[PDB]
């Protein structure tokens, strides 16, 4: 037996969009490839934002 705690083992985060939008899934494929094969952290941020929900992607006003 090992003296560890298992309540925080599974990190709760989006690994994919919960949406079934096929266009969104295609561009998630594109940015998954770009984030994997480039060192640009911008691609990583964009991919994790694509995974997000609508409340986590609020609309941006023109102003």
């Amino acid at each position: 037996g090992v003296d560890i705690r298992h309540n925080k083992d599974r990190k709760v985060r989006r690994k994919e969009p919960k949406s079934q939008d096929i266009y969104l899934r295609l561009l998630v494929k594109l940015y998954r490839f770009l984030a994997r094969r480039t060192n640009s952290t911008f691609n990583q941020v964009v991919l994790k934002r694509l995974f997000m929900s609508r409340t986590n992607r609020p609309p941006l006003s023109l102003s």
């Binding site: 037996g1 090992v2 003296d3 560890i4």
Partner: protein
Amino acid sequence: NFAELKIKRLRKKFAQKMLRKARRKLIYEKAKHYHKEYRQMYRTEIRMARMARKAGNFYVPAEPKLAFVIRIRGINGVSPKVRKVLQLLRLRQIFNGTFVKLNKASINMLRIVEPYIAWGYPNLKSVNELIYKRGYGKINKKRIALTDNALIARSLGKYGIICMEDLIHEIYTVGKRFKEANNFLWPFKLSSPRGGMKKKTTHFVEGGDAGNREDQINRLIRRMN
């Protein structure tokens, strides 16, 4: 451009091979120098004791600066302070071993977890056996076996430790980067002591196994791994 690119790849491979050869020669000579240092220290202790006895005085050796700590009791019914100190020593399992740099703070922690551990002062042979047979690195939070020197070099080369011999030297003679070298090592997962223990529930000085046995930790290690 085919001949030119062949020349380019041959030159690159040859430069890489020469670099590997130079690094291997450096590793060999560092190990030789470490051997010289070890025998110098071992003979120096004997010589100092001899001159003190010739003069009729007493030579008190330096208090040991390295300890090996083995957790001997299990994980059931442990008080919170003992549990916390064992976690800070990285002994979360029975028959787990860890090298500890000895000072006031570490010794007081060892006193706190005294009933749960057996600790002592390992010798050069014990350090060699532990690192070579059961040495695993914490590389990218993974337990990776130390099967190549490149694994040590990629994680500790910024500190000058680039081989098994450098790691063993830093562990044995407690160097400047002992904390980094020791935390790089995964805690040793030792077997059950072959031949059994005396009594895990009492102290070593009262016929048991817990607490500080001075240099009998080497006997324990030989039976342990």
